[PDB]
Assembly symmetry: C2
Homo-oligomer: 49 residues x 2
């Protein structure tokens, strides 16, 4: 009986941690491409002037 507590706690928490890592990677991906666009706006403006 007591083993059932350990089995469900570890794997589902890992599932929560695994889904958290994707969220962190997506946040890094979103932030990385955000500044990439910001570079594009200024480069076009500088060439325009």
């Amino acid at each position: 009986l007591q083993e059932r507590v350990k089995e469900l706690t570890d794997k589902f928490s890992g599932e929560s941690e695994a889904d958290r890592q994707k969220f962190e990677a997506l946040l890094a991906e979103k932030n990385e491409m955000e500044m990439e666009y910001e570079d594009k706006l200024k480069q076009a403006e500088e060439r325009s002037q």
Copy 2:
């Protein structure tokens, strides 16, 4: 035996499920500002010409 199993399974899996909606919202947020930045680049070049 069953009481704990259903208790831990439901609450711990919900934490993993809760990280998916945040991931989906982050993905939707990431896609949305990408279109805005593309519009910004499109409008920045139009005035340049």
